[PDB]
Design a binder for this molecule. Structure first.
Ligand SMILES: NCCCCCCCNS(=O)(=O)c1cccc2c(Cl)cccc12
Ligand SMILES: [Ca+2]
Length: 125
């Protein structure tokens, strides 16, 4: 993993970390290990309107999965959001060919939450 991405995770405030954490739980819905795999990835993408194949799903995870785990964990899913936002990739070129992902990770968060998530109520901080 990149040091910059790691800093981004730590940089995120309580709300930012909490928001991402919630996505992880939903993103890893049905995951035995709790990580986000192609099975969970495909389900999430399906909600967004995408229907990528298992092979494609694993590749996407590989983007944020440097440990070759094949699954996105808490630190990995957080980076994905950060990586998408920053996009340090700077487009390595390559034509649209039969591949091309421009999904908004930030937008995906809404799909993952799809709820006000007001279960917790705290006052008098
Ligand atoms: N300029 C291109 C920037 C892509 C940055 C890479 C993150 C986004 N890739 S993705 O296929 O849209 C995508 C969408 C939802 C979930 C994903 C997960 Cl859990 C893993 C990998 C990918 C995912
Ligand atoms: Ca991983």
């Amino acid at each position: 993993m990149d040091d910059i991405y790691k800093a981004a995770v730590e940089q995120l405030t309580e709300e930012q970390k909490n928001e991402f954490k919630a996505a992880f739980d939903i993103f890893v819905l049905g995951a035995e290990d709790g990580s986000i795999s192609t099975k969970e990835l495909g389900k999430v993408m399906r909600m967004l309107g995408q229907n990528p194949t298992p092979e494609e799903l694993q590749e996407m995870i590989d983007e944020v999965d440097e440990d070759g785990s094949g699954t996105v964990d808490f630190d990995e899913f957080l980076v994905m959001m950060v990586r998408s936002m920053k996009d340090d990739s700077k487009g390595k070129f390559k034509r649209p060919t039969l591949r091309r992902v421009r999904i908004s990770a930030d937008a995906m968060m809404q799909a993952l939450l799809g709820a006000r998530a007001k279960g917790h109520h705290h006052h008098h901080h």
